C-alpha cells in the first residue's frame, strides 16, 4: 500500500506511511514538468480516483492519496513543512522569491481552470 502526497511539482509515495526525514526516505517520486503543473493540480482536484488508478498502474501497488484521507500522512507533513527546500533540491526554485512567484503563477493558472470548469 503506497501513501501519496502531491505538491505542485511532484507526487511522492512511501509504502505503509513510513516516517520521512528526507528525499532518501521517499520510495516513489514522480516529478512534473512545469508547463503541466496547473493541469495536474486541476486533475487532482477534480478526478483524484483517476489519478490514483494511474499511479496504481505506474508504481505497481494500491494507492492511498492524502487528499482522500482525513488524517495527514508522515510524507504529507514532511512535504508541507519543507515545500520550498525540497523543491529547491529538485531544481524548481532557485530562491525564495522565485518560489513565491512560481507558486503564485501555478495557483492563478489552477484558478483559471476551476473558474472555466464552472461554465
Ligand atoms: Na528516516
Domain segments of the chain: what residues?
1-119
Please tell us whether the domain made up of 1-119 is placed in CATH 3.30.420.220. Answer: yes
Cell of 114: 476551476
**Separation of 109 CA from ligand 1 center, angstroms?**
35
β-sheet bridge partners, residue 29? 12
**Separation of 24 CA from ligand 1 center, angstroms?**
7
Structure-solving method: X-ray
What is the helix (H) or strand (E) element at residue 65, kind and residue range?
strand 63-65
**Separation of 28 CA from ligand 1 center, angstroms?**
15
Residue 75 has, within 13 A of its CA and on its CB side, a CA count of 27
d(CA 50, CA 70): 19
d(CA 87, CA 54): 23
Under the phi-then-psi rule, with left for phi > 0, alpha for psi from -120 to 50, and beta for the rest, what region is 95? beta
b/e code 54-74 from CB counts within 10 Å (16+ = b): ebeeebeeebbbbeeeeeebb
95, burial (CB in 10 Å: exposed 0-12, middle 13-18, buried 19+): exposed
**Separation of 23 CA from ligand 1 center, angstroms?**
9
Q: What is the resolution of this structure in A?
A: 1.7
Amino acid at each position: 500500500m503506497i501513501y501519496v502526497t502531491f505538491t505542485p511539482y511532484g507526487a511522492f509515495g512511501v509504502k505503509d506511511n513510513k516516517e520521512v526525514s528526507g528525499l532518501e526516505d521517499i520510495e516513489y517520486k514522480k516529478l512534473f514538468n512545469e508547463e503541466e503543473i496547473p493541469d495536474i493540480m486541476f486533475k487532482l482536484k477534480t478526478q483524484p480516483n483517476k489519478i490514483a488508478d494511474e499511479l496504481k498502474e505506474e508504481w505497481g501497488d494500491e494507492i492511498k492519496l492524502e487528499t482522500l484521507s482525513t488524517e495527514p500522512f508522515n510524507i504529507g507533513e514532511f512535504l508541507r513543512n519543507n515545500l520550498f527546500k525540497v523543491g529547491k533540491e529538485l531544481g524548481y526554485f532557485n530562491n525564495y522569491d522565485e518560489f513565491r512567484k512560481k507558486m503564485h503563477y501555478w495557483s492563478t493558472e489552477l484558478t483559471k481552470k476551476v473558474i472555466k470548469s464552472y461554465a
